[PDB]
Write a protein that binds this DNA or RNA. Structure first.
Ligand SMILES: [Cl-]
Ligand SMILES: [Cl-]
Ligand SMILES: [Mg+2]
Ligand SMILES: [Mg+2]
Ligand SMILES: [Mg+2]
Ligand SMILES: [Mg+2]
Ligand SMILES: [Mg+2]
Ligand SMILES: [Mg+2]
Ligand SMILES: [Mg+2]
Ligand SMILES: [Mg+2]
Ligand SMILES: [Mg+2]
Ligand code: NA
Ligand code: NA
Ligand code: NA
Ligand code: NA
Ligand SMILES: [Sr+2]
Ligand SMILES: [Sr+2]
Ligand SMILES: [Sr+2]
Ligand SMILES: [Sr+2]
Ligand SMILES: [Sr+2]
Ligand SMILES: [Sr+2]
Ligand SMILES: [Sr+2]
Ligand SMILES: [Sr+2]
Ligand SMILES: [Sr+2]
Ligand SMILES: [Sr+2]
Lengths: 92, 237, 194
RNA sequence: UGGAGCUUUACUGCAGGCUGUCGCUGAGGACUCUCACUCCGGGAGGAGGACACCGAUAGCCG
RNA sequence: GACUCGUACGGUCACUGAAUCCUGCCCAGUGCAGGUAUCUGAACACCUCGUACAAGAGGACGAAGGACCUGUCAACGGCG
């Protein structure tokens, strides 16, 4: 389905309608310095490593939209629930 | 499963050991102080159990009686010599250097002094080819060009008992008797005729290996069976 | 002023530097062609020996001991084991080579008791430690004000019970506070969790 | 949501082999050398050589 | 340490199973082996960023292996 790159809508920060810009959320890199990162190292050893021996599961036939709605004025953004969409193209 | 037979071999039990207590003598070359001057007389010819080949008993001047890796042609009374100044005749032992190029040699040392390592089986022989101040090229019975220290001692001639292989065993019993004189477990049951628990090619309703026979060289003992690291197989091509 | 000993000490801070590096290259060749436990007339490291308790007196013996480097020489399990226990290559022993050296030294001298020990280098496969051993039954030792304590019947085979310097550090007893919870007053007493 | 034996490109691991790297290990992307170390020799000495063996670790096969 | 007081006319690993007449075609898949410009390929060391240091992110190099090519069926097997 298609969706406008920009459009007016409620900005929870300014607390009033403003023209937002929609963007698909890009993944942020990992530092590798989180507790979970340290635990994988602490708890891995000879033989099976329990949970750290499991491997990334499957996928769903269709994912929900993962977007950021950034306000054109104050510049801050907010998230919203997503809806399943086989494809999402922006207009302009 | 259970360890395969090739693994029972290593533990070196009676079943897999050679009848050493029945063997006569390693036929390593005699050691000479130097300047040669060492000759002996062939007092008798004997049968070498461990090699199914004849061997000669020699009595050296200094009173030392030893069995020697006999080449073809040695007879009682004959006189053998071992040293650098040794006369280039069949049965004599001298450094590969003192041996003229183009002469058949046997019981060749791998390292000067080891007493001989190569070409000791029936009828075989190494052909000396190239000489030098650094290396002596010898052609081993396998047809391989071997580079040896020219100081490595050897015997002139081919090993006695040639053509031993020409005659067939004919019956199992004959095979039996020879096997009984070597470090070998005989007869042989094909792995494909064994239970799966006993060998990689075992099991199955009908006999046939359940895998390709060419195993990798890094295969672990117990798994390394069949055609080891084969570069090819069959005759075709 | 600095003592003559401080120089032996100083040299051994960096065994692969200076003259000693040269000395070690020398000695080790001889050490390698030597036994497992060899009695020597004088400590290689005088400062260390005297510092550990050594004394130029009767009933005092010194011995160099060779031991293989590396992890544990472990045999692979011959019966069922969960993945966690099918381990062989990375398993290391809980006793350190030095403690192992003191014990071997002690067997050679069934009548002497280990007073202490220290390392004297290693090549790529050996590890050498010199062990100071004492003769509890010789006077001159009994009558000694500094060592007579090692004659007490309570000290019979102190090494095999880990009462040695190296024994106690290995046992995790070095700290008197944090971290020595399951260690003091003994490993066995804490359910063997240290 | 029993047991065991057996199988395999079932899941997960463990030996073993191959391969790189660090230590042993030294002198003047390729080379010479000798002094550790290795092998041959009864010995003198000979062959090899900072490699290999051994210790540690990593990738592949398993 | 066995093999081994053994050394290729040896002895290890496998298949077939006296003699006689014979034993066709297939290397695509799998297996083994060799080769390989390029691609890919770990750790140590090295470089960049980050941190007064460290964690960490990235880079260059690139072993065996793999991709790729070749050999091989009295290898596994196949010949509708
Ligand atoms: Cl035979
Ligand atoms: Cl003691
Ligand atoms: Mg035959
Ligand atoms: Mg058979
Ligand atoms: Mg059967
Ligand atoms: Mg059956
Ligand atoms: Mg099996
Ligand atoms: Mg059949
Ligand atoms: Mg068959
Ligand atoms: Mg005092
Ligand atoms: Mg079951
Ligand atoms: Na004792
Ligand atoms: Na602990
Ligand atoms: Na069963
Ligand atoms: Na094929
Ligand atoms: Sr841990
Ligand atoms: Sr693990
Ligand atoms: Sr799905
Ligand atoms: Sr021999
Ligand atoms: Sr010998
Ligand atoms: Sr089968
Ligand atoms: Sr053919
Ligand atoms: Sr006792
Ligand atoms: Sr036939
Ligand atoms: Sr193929």
């Amino acid at each position: 389905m298609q969706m406008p790159r920009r459009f007016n809508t409620y900005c929870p920060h300014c607390n009033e309608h403003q023209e937002h810009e929609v963007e698909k959320v890009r993944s942020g890199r990992q530092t590798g310095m989180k507790w979970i990162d340290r635990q994988r190292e602490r708890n891995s050893g000879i033989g099976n490593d329990g949970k750290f021996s499991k491997v990334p599961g499957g996928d769903k036939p269709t994912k929900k939209t993962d977007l950021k709605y950034r306000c054109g004025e104050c510049g801050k953004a907010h998230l919203r629930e997503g809806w399943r969409a086989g494809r999402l193209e922006f207009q302009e | 499963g259970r360890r395969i037979q090739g693994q029972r071999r290593g533990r070196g039990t009676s079943t897999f050991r050679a009848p050493s207590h029945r063997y006569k003598a390693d036929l390593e070359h005699r050691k000479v102080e130097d300047g040669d001057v060492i000759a002996g007389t062939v007092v008798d010819i004997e049968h070498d159990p461990a090699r199914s080949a004849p061997v000669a008993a020699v009595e050296f001047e200094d009173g030392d009686r030893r069995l020697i890796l006999a080449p073809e042609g040695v007879g009682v009374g004959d006189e053998l010599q071992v040293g650098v100044d040794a006369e280039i005749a069949p049965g004599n032992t001298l450094p590969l250097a003192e041996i003229p190029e183009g002469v058949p040699v046997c019981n060749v040392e791998s390292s000067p002094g080891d007493g001989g390592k190569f070409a000791r089986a029936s009828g075989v022989n190494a052909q000396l080819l190239t000489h030098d101040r650094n290396v002596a090229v010898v052609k081993l019975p396998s047809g391989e060009m071997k580079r040896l220290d020219p100081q490595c001692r050897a015997t002139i001639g081919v090993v006695g008992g040639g053509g031993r292989t020409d005659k067939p065993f004919v019956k199992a019993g004959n095979k039996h008797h020879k096997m009984k004189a070597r470090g070998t477990k005989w007869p042989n049951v094909r792995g494909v005729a064994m239970n799966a628990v006993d060998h990689p090619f075992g099991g199955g309703g009908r006999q046939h290996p359940g895998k390709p026979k060419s195993i990798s060289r890094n295969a672990p003992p117990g798994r390394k069976v069949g055609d080891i690291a084969s570069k090819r197989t069959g005759r075709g091509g | 002023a600095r003592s003559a000993y401080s120089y032996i000490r100083e040299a051994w801070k960096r065994p692969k530097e200076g003259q000693i590096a040269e000395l070690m290259w020398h000695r080790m060749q001889e050490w390698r062609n030597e036994p497992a436990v060899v009695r020597i007339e004088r400590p290689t490291r005088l400062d260390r020996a005297r510092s550990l308790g050594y004394k130029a007196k009767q009933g005092i013996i010194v011995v160099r001991v060779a031991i293989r480097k590396g992890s544990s020489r472990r045999t692979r399990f011959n019966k069922g084991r969960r993945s966690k226990r099918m381990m062989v290559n990375r398993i290391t022993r809980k006793k350190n080579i030095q403690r192992i050296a003191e014990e071997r030294a002690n067997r050679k001298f069934p009548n002497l008791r280990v007073l202490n020990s220290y390392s004297v280098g290693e090549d790529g496969r050996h590890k050498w430690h010199e062990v100071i051993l004492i003769d509890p039954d010789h006077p001159a030792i009994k009558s000694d004000d500094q060592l007579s304590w090692i004659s007490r019947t309570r000290h019979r085979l102190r090494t095999f019970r880990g009462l040695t310097s190296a024994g106690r550090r290995c046992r995790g007893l070095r700290g008197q506070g944090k971290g020595s919870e399951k260690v003091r007053p003994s490993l066995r007493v804490n359910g063997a969790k240290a």
